[PDB]
Paper text:
We show that an opportunistic pathogen, Stenotrophomonas maltophilia, harbours a type IV secretion system (T4SS) that works as a weapon to kill competitor bacterial species. Heterologous expression of Smlt3024 in the periplasm of E. coli reduced growth rate, which could be counteracted by co-expression with its cognate immunity protein, Smlt3025. Results showed that Smlt3024 is toxic when directed to the periplasm of E. coli cells (pBRA-pelB-smlt3024) but not in the cytoplasm (pBRA-smlt3024), and that only Smlt302545-333, which is predicted by the SignalP 5.0 algorithm to be directed to the periplasm, could neutralize Smlt3024 toxicity. When a mixture of these proteins was analysed by SEC-MALS followed by SDS-PAGE, a new peak was observed containing both Smlt3024 and Smlt302586-333 with an estimated molecular mass calculated by MALS of 74.2 kDa, showing that a stable 1:1 complex (theoretical mass of 77 kDa) was formed between Smlt3024 and Smlt302586-333.
We successfully crystallized a soluble fragment of Smlt3025, corresponding to residues 86–333. Crystals belonged to space group R3, some of which diffracted to around 2 Å resolution. An analysis of Smlt3025 homologues using the Consurf algorithm identified conserved positions which, once mapped onto the Smlt3025 structure, cluster into the hydrophobic core of the central β-sheet and to the N-terminal β-hairpins. Interestingly, the crystal structure of Smlt3025 revealed a topology similar to the iron-regulated protein FrpD, the cognate binding partner of FrpC, an RTX protein of unknown function secreted by the type I secretion system (T1SS) of Neisseria meningitidis. However, the loops connecting the β-strands have significant differences, for example α2 and the β11-β12 hairpin in Smlt3025 are absent in FrpD. Previous NMR chemical shift perturbation studies identified the surface-exposed portions of the N-terminal β strands (preceding the central β sheet), the C-terminal portion of the last α helix and the unstructured C-terminal tail of FrpD as the probable binding site for FrpC. Although the corresponding surface of Smlt3025 has significantly different structural features at the N-terminus, due to a different relative orientation of its β1-β2 hairpin, the C-terminal α helices and the β3-β4 hairpins of the two proteins superpose well and the N-terminal β hairpins are amongst the most well conserved sequences in Smlt3025 homologues.
Numbering used by the authors: 86 to 293, 294A, 295 to 333
The structure:
């Protein structure tokens, strides 16, 4: 309860901790982490926000309208208690197509949405890029056309670049999908602490997944592809929050 921001519509914004339930655990999260900067929205899970480049929360109340922070620096963080699926296999199930294709359908053989049909690329930023295998699309498009009378649609929005990081035993520990350079340009540029946008350009986006197996949490970040180089500091900032705020 140390720091104080504006008072708007009667509410004085502070960084005082707020009790947040995720499964059976209670996390005492400084209010200014929260998307609302007051209390969790109704529903399961919570949304936090951190700010590029130092992965610190928005100053208390600075996101409240009229905002005083720079919205282009925000990185929204959806944290969920995982109780509908196994947390230990979540990242492998997101990177395949068992859920979005029917058992034994032509679409279950789609190489685009299965990690085990994509092609590993050379490491960069500690990530293994995984690319679409156009040779497998030829075979797929044949059985798809012969069975529907139509060649399959190559919609660039659903042909994202994928990135994988792994633990020593091979388990997936990070999974990131980004708009391809064919779908979207970066739409912003960075030098130092500040990000200024390119108008008429839609910023390329990534979604970035990881889990906390011990707390049974999934974490989903949505951020501009221009921020991708700092993916590890983002994980580090969120895992520190999770570690520090959990009520022992
Ligand atoms: Br919230
Ligand atoms: Br609501
Ligand atoms: Br302020
Ligand atoms: Br779930
Ligand atoms: Br390599
Ligand atoms: Br997709
Ligand atoms: Br895995
Ligand atoms: Br993990
Ligand atoms: Br922007
Ligand atoms: Br998405
Ligand atoms: Br904290
Ligand atoms: Cl509280
Ligand atoms: Cl919950
Ligand atoms: Cl590899
Ligand atoms: Cl490995």
């Amino acid at each position: 309860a140390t720091q104080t921001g504006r008072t708007i519509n009667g509410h004085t914004y502070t960084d005082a901790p707020v009790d947040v339930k995720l499964g059976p655990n209670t996390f005492r999260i400084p209010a200014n982490y929260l998307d609302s900067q007051i209390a969790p929205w109704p529903g399961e899970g919570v949304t936090l926000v951190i700010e590029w480049p130092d992965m610190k929360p928005t100053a208390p109340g600075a996101r409240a309208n009229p905002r005083t922070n720079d919205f282009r620096k925000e990185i929204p963080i959806r944290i969920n208690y995982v109780d509908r699926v196994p947390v230990e296999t979540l990242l492998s199930r997101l990177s395949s197509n068992e859920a979005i294709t029917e058992e034994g359908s032509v679409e279950r053989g789609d190489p685009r949405d299965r990690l085990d049909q994509r092609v590993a690329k050379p490491q960069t930023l500690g990530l293994t890029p995984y690319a679409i295998d156009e040779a497998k699309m030829v075979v797929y498009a044949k059985k798809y056309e012969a069975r529907y009378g139509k060649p399959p649609v190559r919609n660039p929005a659903y042909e994202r670049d994928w990135y994988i990081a792994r633990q020593g035993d091979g388990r997936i520990s990070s999974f990131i999908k980004c708009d391809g350079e064919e779908f979207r340009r970066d739409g912003v540029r960075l030098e130092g602490r500040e990000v200024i946008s390119e108008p008429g350009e839609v910023a390329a986006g990534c979604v970035h997944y990881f889990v906390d197996i011990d707390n049974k949490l999934s974490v989903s970040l949505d951020y501009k592809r221009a921020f991708l180089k700092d993916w590890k500091r983002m994980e580090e900032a969120v895992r520190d929050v999770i570690a520090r705020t959990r009520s022992k």
